[PDB]
Design a protein around this nucleic acid. Structure first.
Lengths: 126, 206, 61, 96
RNA sequence: GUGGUUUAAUUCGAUGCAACGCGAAGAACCUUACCUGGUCUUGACAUCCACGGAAGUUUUCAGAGAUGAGAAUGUGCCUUCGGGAACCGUGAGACAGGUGCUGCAUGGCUGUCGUCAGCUCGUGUUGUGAAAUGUUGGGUUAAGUCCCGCAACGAGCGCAACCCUUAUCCUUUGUUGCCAGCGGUCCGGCCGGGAACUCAAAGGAGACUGCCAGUGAUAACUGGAGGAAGGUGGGGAUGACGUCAAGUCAUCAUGGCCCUUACGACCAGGGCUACACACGUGCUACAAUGGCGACUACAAAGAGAAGCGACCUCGCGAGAGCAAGCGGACCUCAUAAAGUGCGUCGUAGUCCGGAUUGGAGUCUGCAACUCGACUCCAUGAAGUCGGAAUCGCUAGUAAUCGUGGAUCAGAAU
C-alpha cells in the first residue's frame, strides 16, 4: 500500500494506492457516484494514465473541505505523489506533466482600489 | 505631506500603550472617555512638573494612573499636600475610587515629550530657536542617546513668512520599525502666532 | 385621552387595585412605558437627547 | 482530573492568568498537562476607512476570543486552595 | 444628482480633469441653517456674587399647546441648635453666546501632479561672477541598479532592507478532526478510544544566482538541472524637496472683523420627492448552452437580549398566536445559488418583457393623501437589440451567479 496527501485550494484528499482491479472509493462512494456528472472528474485519474496504472491499481480516497472541483485536483496530487512511493523512477515521467506540483493559487480577498484585488482600474482614453 | 506617527506606528512593537485594560464592549466608551478626561487635568494641573506620560490601568471599579514626572516634588507638594488635592479633585470627575502614583523620570533630556516643552517654553518667551534646537539636540545627545532631531515650524523669529528650522545628530531612522524612537509635540502660543515643536529621540535599536 | 387617562383616578372601578395600569406622564402613552422613568419609549428618547434626563447618556459603538 | 478552559478577548491577559493558574498548581499538585492555545473563533468587520469616496478602501477589523486548556490532574486539597484564593485577571472568564 | 423653470421658503457650499449617491456613515417633527403666525428671558451654554422660602414626589383648575394659577406628602447631611455643605427656584448684580464674515490672516488634516525617481548637502577643485565639477563619459539595468573611467572624497532624503497576510515543510498542543486503526453503533463520531490526518495557535525551517552550458573586462544577461515557490513568488501599510495662494474658519482650534429683545429662544402649521424640457452617474432588458414546477447534492465568511427565532398551529402568502434552545466554532438566521435527476413550454410580441393602473392586505414608525418597502389578485405598455462617438481588460483574472456585513427603527440597483 502507498499513500499521498494531495492538496488544492482548500481541500485535502488522502490517496491510499493498493494493487487491485481498478476501482476507486471516494468517501465510501464510487468515483462516478461522488463526482456524478462532472466532466472534470476525469482529470483526477490522469496521473494514473501517464504511468499506465488504474487497471493495475485500486485506490481508496478520503477528501474533505473545499469544493468538488478543488477535491478533484487534490485527489490528483495525492495519486501522483502516491505513485512516487511505489516507484520513484516514475518521477522522471510523472513530473514532466507537473502533477507533482501543488497549485498554490488561493482565492485571495478581492482587494479594493482595484476590481480584481490584483488588476487595477485603468483610465479612459487620456 | 506627513509621516506616520512614530509612536502609533510602533505600538505593535517596542512602544507600549498609554492605557492598558481588559476589553468591555459596552463600557469601552465610558472608560476611554474617562481616561481622556483624567488626562485633561493631568495635562494642565501637572504642567509645571514635566509630565512625560500618564499610563492608565483599570480593574473592576478602580484606576491606577501613573503620572511620570521629571520633578515629582512639585506634584507631591509640601510634605505631600498636592497629591492629596489631586486624588480628591480627580475623584469629583469619576466617583470610582482612583489611585495615583508619581514615578520620576531619570534625566528628562532622554524624554522627547519633555524636550519639546523645554524648546517651546524658550520660544514662547523669545529666544533664537536656532540656538534652542541646537542646544536641545545637543542636550539629549550629551546625555547619551544614539540620535536626535528637532523641528519648529510657524513664523520663527516673528518673521512674516513661515519657516521650518531643522538640525539633528546621530541616527533617527523613522522607517526602521524597531528603532524605538520616543516622539513628542509641544504647541507654543505667541503674540505673532502658533508654532509646532517636534523632537525625536532615538535610544537603542532593540 | 382625558377620558382614557382614568388611571389618574387612584380608586379603580369594579376591578381590583390591579386594574391600575401605567400611562406615560408626558405623552400619556400606555403602549411602551419605562417604569423607572414613567415615560414612554418615544418620550424617553426625546428627553434623552435634550439632556433633561440626569445620568442618562446615549450608548456608543 | 480538573480541566480549566480559560477564554478572553485580550491575548495577553490570558497568558498572564493561564500561566499563574499553572505555576501555582505546579507546586501543590501535578505539573498540569500544560497550558495550550486551542482554536480561536475570530470575528471580523470590514467597514470603510475614509467616510467618503475612496470606496476602494474599507479596512479590515477583528475581535478574537482566545481559549486555553491547562487541565490539572491529580488535584490535592492545597491544589485547589491555591486557586480559590488568588484571582487577578478580570478580562478572563474561568471555567473549572 | 444637477441645470432650467418654479415657489412664501424648495438653506448653503462644491464646478473641466482635481463639481455632480459631492460634505449629509441615512432630512418624517429632530437634524435645518427656510417661511407665516402666537410667545419668552441671566435666558438653550460658561464663571461668580448677594438674597426671604429652598432637595424631592404626586395631583387639580384653565387651555389648541405653551403658559399661568393652585393644592398636598417633607429632609436626611457637617456641628449646637444655631450655624452650615449640596443641588434646586424666584428677585437682583457681574456676564455668556454666534455653523455671522474672512481659510489668500492661519494651525491641524486631507486631495492632487506621484510610488512618479530622483532630488540635495559637507568639504575640495575650476570661474571676476551667475555657476560648473561630483549626477558628464564607456558597458549595463526596471531604475544616478551596478561596473569601469574620471579632482573628486564622503553623506542625507528616495530606492532596497527591517513588520503583517497568503503558498510547501517541521516542532509544541488539542472536547475541531478521523475506524486513518480497532470495538460498540437507535450506524447520527454518535459512543469507547486515540492523535495520525484536516484544522487552530505559537515558534521555527525555506531562494542566495549557489550549481551546469553560452556570452562578457566586470557587473550582468540567456538556456538548463535540482526544487513546494526563484530572481523583489503573490497582496498590504508607507507617498520625497515642493505645486495649484487647491479644500475645509459647519468637525475642532485660531488672528482680525461684525451682531448682542434681537441675524438669540419656544411652539403650531407649511416644503426639499413642485415641471414643457436639458445633462451626468446608474439600474432592468430581449431566452431554449432558456424560463418554469417538483425532487435533490456541495461553500465560505459573517450576525444574534429582547435579539436570531427552531418546532407547532391559523392564513394562498406577508404575517399572526404559541413557544424550545443558545449567549453561541455545541440553539438560530440557512434554504446557498448555479449544479444534478424528471417533467413542461415553440418563435408569436409569445408562459419573451415587465412599465402603468385598479382592488385587497402585511410590516416599520406617534403618526406613511405630494414621500415607503413588501405580499396577493387584476391590468400588462415601450421594447424584436438600437443615428453621429466612445469605454473596460492579459488568468483563476475577464465575464457571469448567489451570499453575509458596516451605517441602521426604515428608500445600497
Amino acid at each position: 500500500q502507498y499513500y499521498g496527501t494531495g492538496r488544492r485550494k482548500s481541500s485535502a484528499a488522502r490517496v491510499f494506492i493498493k494493487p487491485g482491479n481498478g476501482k476507486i472509493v471516494i468517501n465510501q462512494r464510487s468515483l462516478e457516484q461522488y463526482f456524478g456528472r462532472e466532466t472534470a472528474r476525469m482529470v483526477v485519474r490522469q496521473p494514473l494514465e501517464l504511468v499506465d496504472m488504474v487497471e493495475k491499481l485500486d485506490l481508496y480516497i478520503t477528501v474533505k473541505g473545499g469544493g468538488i472541483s478543488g477535491q478533484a485536483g487534490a485527489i490528483r496530487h495525492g495519486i501522483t505523489r502516491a505513485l512516487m512511493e511505489y516507484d520513484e523512477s516514475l518521477r522522471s515521467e510523472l513530473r514532466k506533466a507537473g502533477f507533482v506540483t501543488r497549485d498554490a493559487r488561493q482565492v485571495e480577498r478581492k482587494k479594493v482600489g482595484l476590481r480584481k484585488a490584483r488588476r487595477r482600474p485603468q483610465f479612459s482614453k487620456r | 505631506g506627513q509621516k506616520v506617527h512614530p509612536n502609533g506606528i510602533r505600538l505593535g512593537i517596542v512602544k507600549p500603550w498609554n492605557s492598558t485594560w481588559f476589553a468591555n464592549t459596552k463600557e469601552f466608551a465610558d472608560n476611554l472617555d474617562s481616561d481622556f478626561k483624567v488626562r485633561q487635568y493631568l495635562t494642565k494641573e501637572l504642567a509645571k512638573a514635566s509630565v512625560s506620560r500618564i499610563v492608565i490601568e483599570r480593574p473592576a471599579k478602580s484606576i491606577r494612573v501613573t503620572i511620570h514626572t521629571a520633578r515629582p516634588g512639585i506634584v507631591i507638594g509640601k510634605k505631600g499636600e498636592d497629591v492629596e488635592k489631586l486624588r480628591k479633585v480627580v475623584a469629583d470627575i469619576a466617583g470610582v475610587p482612583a489611585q495615583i502614583n508619581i514615578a520620576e523620570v531619570r534625566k528628562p533630556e532622554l524624554d522627547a515629550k519633555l524636550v519639546a516643552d523645554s524648546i517651546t517654553s524658550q520660544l514662547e518667551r523669545r529666544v533664537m530657536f536656532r540656538r534652542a534646537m541646537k542646544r536641545a539636540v545637543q542636550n539629549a545627545m550629551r546625555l547619551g542617546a544614539k540620535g536626535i532631531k528637532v523641528e519648529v515650524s510657524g513664523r520663527l523669529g516673528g518673521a512674516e513668512i513661515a519657516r521650518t528650522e531643522w538640525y539633528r545628530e546621530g541616527r533617527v531612522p523613522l522607517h526602521t520599525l524597531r528603532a524605538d524612537i520616543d516622539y513628542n509635540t509641544s504647541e507654543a502660543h505667541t503674540t505673532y502666532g502658533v508654532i509646532g515643536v517636534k523632537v525625536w529621540i532615538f535610544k537603542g535599536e532593540i | 385621552r382625558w377620558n382614557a387617562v382614568l388611571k389618574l383616578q387612584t380608586l379603580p372601578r369594579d376591578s381590583s387595585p390591579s386594574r391600575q395600569r401605567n400611562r406615560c406622564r408626558q405623552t400619556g402613552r400606555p403602549h411602551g412605558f419605562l417604569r423607572k422613568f414613567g415615560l414612554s419609549r418615544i418620550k424617553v428618547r426625546e428627553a434623552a437627547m435634550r439632556g433633561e434626563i440626569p445620568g442618562l447618556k446615549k450608548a456608543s459603538w | 482530573r480538573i480541566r480549566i478552559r480559560l477564554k478572553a478577548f485580550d491575548h495577553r491577559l490570558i497568558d498572564q492568568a493561564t500561566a499563574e493558574i499553572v505555576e501555582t498548581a505546579k507546586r501543590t499538585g501535578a505539573q498540569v498537562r500544560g497550558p495550550i492555545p486551542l482554536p480561536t473563533r475570530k470575528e471580523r468587520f470590514t467597514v470603510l476607512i475614509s467616510p467618503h469616496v475612496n470606496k476602494d478602501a474599507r479596512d479590515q477589523y477583528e475581535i478574537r476570543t482566545h481559549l486555553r486548556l491547562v487541565d490539572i490532574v491529580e488535584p490535592t486539597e492545597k491544589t485547589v486552595d491555591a486557586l480559590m484564593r488568588l484571582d487577578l485577571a478580570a478580562g478572563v472568564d474561568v471555567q473549572i
